[PDB]
Curated annotation (Swiss-Prot), chains A, B:
Keywords: Cell membrane, Cell projection, Disulfide bond, G-protein coupled receptor, Glycoprotein, Membrane, Receptor, Signal, Synapse, Transducer, Transmembrane, Transmembrane helix
Effect of residue 647 to G: Impairs interaction with HTR2A
Protein name: Metabotropic glutamate receptor 2
Tissue expression summary: Detected in brain cortex (at protein level). Widely expressed in different regions of the adult brain as well as in fetal brain.
Stretches assigned to the Extracellular side: 1-544, 603-613, 663-687, 746-755
Originating species: Homo sapiens (Human)
Gene Ontology MF terms in the entry: calcium channel regulator activity; G protein-coupled receptor activity; glutamate receptor activity; group II metabotropic glutamate receptor activity; scaffold protein binding
Residues that, per the record, bind L-glutamate: 34, 38, 122, 143, 145, 272, 354
Residue spans, topological domain Cytoplasmic: 568-581, 710-722
Transmembrane segments: 545-567, 582-602, 614-632, 642-662, 688-709, 723-745, 756-781
Alphabetized PROSITE patterns for the sequence: G_PROTEIN_RECEP_F3_1, G_PROTEIN_RECEP_F3_2, G_PROTEIN_RECEP_F3_3, G_PROTEIN_RECEP_F3_4
Gene from which the chain derives: GRM2
GO CC field: astrocyte projection; axon; dendrite; glutamatergic synapse; plasma membrane; postsynaptic membrane; presynaptic membrane
Lineage: Eukaryota, Metazoa, Chordata, Craniata, Vertebrata
Disulfide bonds: 27-69, 211-495, 332-339, 377-384, 477-496, 481-499, 502-514, 517-530, 609-683
GO biological process: behavioral response to nicotine; cellular response to stress; chemical synaptic transmission; G protein-coupled glutamate receptor signaling pathway; gene expression; glutamate secretion; intracellular glutamate homeostasis; long-term synaptic depression
Length: 782, 782
């Protein structure tokens, strides 16, 4: 059937009056929820346009409406009808079986259609758009929610009033960023609807500072085992309790039913698939707590409802499908003439949510036509003779794309308009519905805000945001930490991470990995890396170092007293027949060893440690030489004993200096604990062959001293002989005690060194006392 | 007009009978080169199909041909006619001015078209493909060379027989890789054809081991200044002498004219735009030398020509445009009845290159129809009643894509077939034409090879490759070099580079950059990097080192002789009242200095450096102490002089050893030349405070010796006194001479050290001789 209303400017019309019915019938039984209501809405819109004094005052508006019944071949044939009526007006009727006349001259062909207002489903809209691409005719839809038509490459002459899916994805992104829900999951659908929406959502996510936890898809219909598996995979992540949904109504209902059966609480926000329908939450009211829903902006129209109420098949015979709709709504037949008793005013009527979009499309087309007529021939309001061929390219790319007008039948409360972007898509105007948990009984959706160009909503109506009694429901991954514990570990996630402290001795210079520097130095607080840290020149405490200094001072005082007693008693008979010069050399050696023991506790460094070990070796050599001379020079001439003593001392000094110079006495800093500040404590001259050769030389010197001491028949000055014997015995005992002590305490930092220094000082003091005792006894006797 | 031929299965046809003529007429005057020839070819093809016993023996074949005249609206309306005839057969004629009957029942509507054979230009092909995409009808073209239709997303039910532009780009890539022409330039065009070809060529280039020099584009038509500028930019590169061209015929002719005007020799290969046309090379014969041309594979048909020769408007009234073509070819009108005198056999006829392609398209459609009829209803050869509704989806995606048949009117020489790829495009078969420089007069194209699936051509007909007298003309960038000079520099090119040698001391580890290692070591030949190179322990030559060794041996022999003379003459009066022990100490010091001078020419190392400098300092101190003792101990006790001498020697030794240990005597290797092998020649103990303190101590010792030399009234042993005076004078002179010599030659490698060693050896020998002369004189006197 064809619905034709006369007029100079006629517009196309497409509405699915019927529904799917299989290949048995033509295309299916007549529908009464989508097609007839939108058809009557378009008729009312054109009636108001014809009666509008401000809009199109001179010329009227025609109407050419064809059935679509949600079919493909039928819609294609109806588009062929439109194109044959529009373009084929140039060629007359060809030769056919018509014997009355050759061709039609005035009738049998309507005027060229200016535009078409039709196409609700995705497939029919795609087909109409692809068919009307080449014929240079504009096309506007009213329920085209598919986002695959936004591209102008495949669909150029196509516009829509409802917002596409990427607008809804942007609204989802805005409502997620408003609540700081960076860590969010997504659920897709295997149908035609949802894939482009999820793609746009993921693109907007990866665009600006937000990521996604997981990406799952749900099929059309299968066993509940797959639903249980996918919901378990969703709830597997403990930190994932918020997710977006882009599925249908039945799929959302079954998902909520499965969630209620599994008894798990979540905070779910969905797309327009949920909507304001109540059948999707039937039997699952205690499972959608704290849910956010996106509703398409649509307000009821009082004038359209009043016009639809006063409808009857008696005085309104224009619409051919009106009788079919009347027979479908009320079970009756017009043959028996019994349908007149029924009235439409008695039965309650609910307006379709798409009526406002249809009337907006019609009024936008009317405004575009008015603007074209005003900008083309402004001489008079009558029809211009220069616009008889409908030029769709100009009317599309010059007028309808840039429209600025207020919404029709809009209440004084709202302030909205109708515009189109560069892609010919309507602006995204949505409403936010919250699952309010009102204590007055049942739970129902509550309007809390709207999203047109900017997100403007309040928390005064949100149940989990109004009192702020507890923490705001949000999913976060790695937010809590500062620039003190920088380590980051990522098991399987790239967007977020796990903020973990690193080692305290490791520098902090990168926000993804922790760099571990050397153990001998600590990082700096200037945020530049890990380098050396300044140490102290003096490390030993004053109280502990006072002992060695006091011992050295006492030894020096004893040596000075012995030297003074030897100088004063220079004419004594005991010192005359003895090594007076050798006694002075021994006193000088004692002074030198005391000075070396005092300097051994100075600021440690390379030269410090080398001088300390050289002084220790020289002290050992000079004490051995002094003992050997006292054992030898007493009895082998008086000038050869000191000569060979100095010779052996110089030889031992050269040996030890060679042994210490052949090695590599560095100045490294080593700390015993794992994480501690490294300070200079000991020299790098660790266990090597130098100390072994020094110990071997000391042992050889001790053996020579013992061989010289083996004499026991000395009848002259037995007191000094027994004193030297006791002194060498004490020295050997101290050396034997310090050998295993130093060998076992070598791992110590300052205990072994201090113990060895104290032992050396005590041995030197004992030797000085034993040397001074013979001179004191000789002075007391004579 | 419509050409209708009876048949159960009717095939569609579209041909541009007319051409562009402006909006004044309908669409333009009738053509006689493209439309009528292809229309007659299709008519002859269907005529042969009807008489073919092997192909469609039972059922005939219909025809429905509509005019296109290379337009958009006309072709759109004629495709509208096809769709109205095919799909609208379900519904009868609507109510119209026809008063004879309600609607047509048998006539006024032909059967549904099974397929359509039409579309030559790009725009008409795009329009037909976009229109017939929705009605599930297959479409095959005969001259659709546009490559933007290969995608199945926008054009799914579209097939072609001519190869698209990407096949030609692949053929160009193959013929370029055959000649090893990696470095090539490209010239594009601003028209509709050429952009996708250049894009595919660049994609194939960047795909596998070949790059492009430049990418220029030429507009449609402008002044010659732009052409001169673009050709100058093309010839700017000296190594660029090979170019590909994807332009039209007129553009190629104008470019050849500009090149002949500029007088530049080039080797240019072009696309099918050049072809075998002779008007494009008129006036520019001496400019396209050594040119390669791609020609579309097309062979003449004898049967089609014989059928076209026997044509007349008397017994052939089917074609409506035949009368228009006859009136266009011969200037006459059928009103005067004077056109019968002219005959088509008299005037020569040239077959169009697209005749074979449309014939192959029609025969492929017939083969697909036969295969479908055989695989659907194999019961009988008659038409099946189950295939009355033409199902285009199965007929397309099951039969026309996979066809295996030989080409019609196939000459026994060639071996080719007709196939379609996954995108429904014909296989790429081209011919290679070479600008042969034959000495028989004018120059013309010569067929040298064909390209269907693999490049098979010979050089026996190529003028620049048959004798191989000179090098093959090829453009290369950075081919000549090996893994010996690895450096690479790239001024403005990324694909190729410039192969330049690097520094010989720099290791080779990457083919893009040269890594320069340290100067103190040379890279290895094992291709592992740059590390240290083994040196020699001994560096001084044997002949040069024999001098110092001989001097040391002579000094040691002199010292031994002096010691033996002193030991034998131990009872001499001169040696009795003198320092005999001091003489032995001086002899030992001479032996020590000789040993130090001998060891100073050993293998250089850290310990070697320390021992050498310590021995030099000890020798200086020992000679100073020996001189001081000889000046002092001769006259202040006999046991105190040697004591203070040994004390001063030990003090100087401690001073010099401290000065040498406080420094950092490394073991680095330094080479004087910039690029030479580094060997251990000079030590790390460079100019510092240690040598300054040593020189200061030596100067103080020399000043003390000179102060002791002030005695001039010695009456005992004046001979030894004057000998010691001459010795100390010679030593001071040698030291003063070696000071500035060393200060000036420190920059040398081995001259300064050898000179200093020789001077030290000479001074030691002179001192030994002066010391032995007094003992020798005393022995001679007594």
């Amino acid at each position: 059937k064809v619905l034709t209303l006369e007029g100079d400017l006629v517009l196309g019309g497409l509405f699915p009056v019927h529904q799917k019915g299989g290949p048995a019938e033509d295309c299916g039984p007549v529908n009464e929820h989508r097609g007839i209501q939108r058809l009557e809405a378009m008729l009312f819109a054109l009636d108001r346009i014809n009666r509008d004094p401000h809009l199109l005052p001179g010329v009227r508006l025609g109407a050419h409406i064809l059935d679509s019944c949600s079919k493909d071949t039928h819609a294609l044939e109806q588009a062929l009808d439109f194109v044959r009526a529009s373009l084929s007006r140039g060629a007359d009727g060809s030769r056919h079986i018509c014997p009355d006349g050759s061709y039609a001259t005035h009738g049998d062909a309507p005027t060229a259609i200016t535009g078409v207002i039709g196409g609700s489903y995705s497939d029919v809209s795609i087909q109409v758009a692809n068919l009307l691409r080449l014929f240079q005719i504009p096309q506007i839809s009213y329920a085209s929610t598919s986002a695959k038509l936004s591209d102008k490459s495949r669909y150029d002459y196509f516009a829509r009033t409802v917002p596409p899916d990427f607008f809804q994805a942007k609204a989802m992104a805005e409502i997620l960023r408003f609540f700081n829900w960076t860590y969010v999951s997504t659920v897709a659908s295997e149908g035609d609807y949802g894939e482009t929406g999820i793609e746009a959502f993921e693109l907007e996510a990866r665009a600006r500072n937000i990521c996604v936890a997981t990406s799952e898809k749900v099929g059309r219909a299968m066993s509940r085992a797959a639903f249980e598996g996918v919901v378990r995979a969703l709830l597997q992540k403990p930190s994932a309790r918020v997710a977006v949904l882009f599925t249908r109504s039945e799929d959302a209902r079954e998902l909520l039913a499965a969630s209620q059966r599994l008894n798990a609480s979540f905070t779910w926000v969905a797309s327009d698939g949920w909507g304001a329908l109540e059948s999707v939450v039937a039997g699952s009211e205690g499972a959608a707590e704290g849910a956010i829903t996106i509703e398409l902006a649509s307000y009821p129209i009082s004038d359209f409802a009043s016009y639809f109420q006063s409808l009857d098949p008696w005085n309104n015979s224009r619409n051919p499908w009106f009788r079919e709709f009347w027979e479908q709504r009320f079970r009756c037949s017009f043959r028996q003439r019994d349908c007149a008793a029924h009235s439409l005013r008695a039965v309650p009527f609910e307006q379709e949510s798409k009526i406002m979009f249809v009337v907006n499309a019609v009024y936008a087309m009317a405004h575009a036509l008015h603007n074209m007529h005003r900008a083309l021939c402004p001489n008079t309001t009558r029809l211009c003779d220069a616009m008889r061929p409908v030029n769709g390219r100009r009317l599309y790319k010059d007028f309808v794309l840039n429209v600025k007008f207020d919404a029709p039948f809009r209440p004084a409360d709202t302030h909205n308009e109708v515009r189109f972007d560069r892609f010919g898509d309507g602006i995204g105007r949505y409403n936010i519905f919250t699952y309010l948990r009102a204590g007055s009984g049942r739970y129902r959706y509550q309007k809390v805000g709207y999203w047109a160009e900017g997100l403007t909503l309040d928390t005064s109506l949100i149940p989990w945001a109004s009192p702020s009694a507890g923490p705001l429901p949000a999913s976060r991954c790695s937010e809590p930490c500062l620039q003190n514990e920088v380590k980051s570990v990522q098991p399987g996630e790239v967007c977020c991470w796990l903020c973990i402290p690193c080692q305290p001795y490791e520098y902090r210079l990168d926000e993804f990995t922790c760099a571990d520097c050397g153990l001998g130095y600590w990082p700096n607080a200037s945020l530049t890396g890990c380098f050396e840290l300044p140490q102290e020149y003096i490390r030993w405490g004053d109280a502990w170092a006072v002992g060695p200094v006091t011992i050295a001072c006492l030894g020096a005082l004893a040596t000075l007293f012995v030297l003074g007693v030897f100088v004063r008693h220079n004419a004594t008979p005991v010192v005359k027949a003895s090594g007076r010069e050798l006694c002075y050399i021994l006193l000088g050696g004692v002074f030198l060893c005391y000075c070396m023991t005092f300097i051994f506790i100075a600021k440690p460094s390379t030269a410090v440690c080398t001088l300390r070990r050289l002084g220790l070796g020289t002290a050992f050599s000079v004490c051995y030489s002094a003992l050997l001379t006292k054992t030898y020079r007493i009895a082998i001439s008086p000038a050869s004993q000191v000569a060979i003593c100095l010779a052996l001392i110089s030889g031992q000094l050269l040996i030890v200096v060679a042994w210490l110079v052949v090695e590599a006495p560095g100045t490294g800093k080593e700390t015993a604990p794992e994480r501690r500040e490294v300070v200079t404590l000991r020299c790098n001259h660790r266990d090597a062959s130098m100390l072994g050769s020094l110990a071997y030389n000391v042992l050889l010197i001790a053996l020579c001293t013992l061989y010289a001491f083996k004499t026991r028949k000395c009848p002259e000055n037995f007191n000094e002989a027994k004193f030297i014997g006791f002194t060498m015995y004490t020295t050997c005992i101290i050396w034997l005690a310090f050998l295993p002590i130093f060998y076992v305490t070598s791992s110590d930092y300052r205990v072994q060194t201090t113990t060895m220094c104290v032992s050396v000082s005590l041995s030197g003091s004992v030797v000085l006392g034993c040397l001074f005792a013979p001179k004191l006894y000789i002075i007391l006797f004579q």
